[PDB]
């Protein structure tokens, strides 16, 4: 399968979360997303093919996993926006006030602005501290999914949100909205990960 932020797959045949971002370690070929999404050792399938297993992942405390993929698996540099795509260039932290996107399976390509950082979410399963929170809209099943500037500067990956019975946030104002992604920068060198780029 072709390895794109923003993309659907599956857990155990079970839940659906997004992918984040392309990434090697060494020689092998991954993709690092939310850590809520699997459990260490849980498979990954696209397009209903098996593409890998979750290698690492820290849920709560923070939400972050990367998927080890076989060598079959086509990494790219990129980002699903509707059919077409953004190119991830980097991975430079945006400043609170930037302007920023995510790409989900629910809720497609939504953008906003980040409006604050180091912000604590209650889950279910334990707190998780240090996000970064946006007024962009997003929806159940967008977790893992690329966080990303329009200048290609990969953010982070999609953890939570304050949902509505509806599902996602998109129905109330921006003023109203906490979306929360995970920073990127602590993924990579938890993992020794290198972003694929272009």
Do not use: A, K, R, Y
């Given at each position: 399968a072709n390895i794109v932020g923003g993309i659907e797959y599956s857990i155990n045949n079970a839940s659906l979360c997004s992918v984040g971002f392309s990434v090697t370690r060494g020689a092998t070929k991954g993709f690092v997303t939310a850590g809520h999404c699997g459990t260490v050792n849980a498979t990954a399938r696209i397009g209903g093919a098996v593409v890998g297993t979750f290698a690492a992942r820290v849920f709560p405390g923070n939400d972050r996993a990367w998927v080890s993929l076989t060598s079959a698996q086509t990494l790219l540099p990129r980002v699903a926006n509707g059919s077409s795509f953004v190119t991830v260039r980097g991975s430079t932290e945006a400043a609170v006030g930037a302007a920023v996107c995510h790409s989900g399976r629910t809720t497609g390509y939504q953008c906003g602005t980040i409006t604050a950082k180091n912000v604590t979410a209650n889950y279910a399963e334990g707190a998780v501290r240090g996000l970064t929170q946006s007024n962009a809209c997003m929806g159940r099943g967008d977790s893992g999914g690329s966080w990303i500037t329009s200048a290609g500067q990969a953010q982070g990956v999609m953890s939570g949100g304050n949902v509505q019975s509806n599902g996602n946030?998109?129905?109330?104002p921006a003023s109203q909205r906490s979306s929360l992604f995970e920073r990127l920068q602590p993924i990579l060198s938890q993992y020794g990960l290198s972003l694929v780029t272009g």
């Open positions: 946030n998109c129905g109330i």
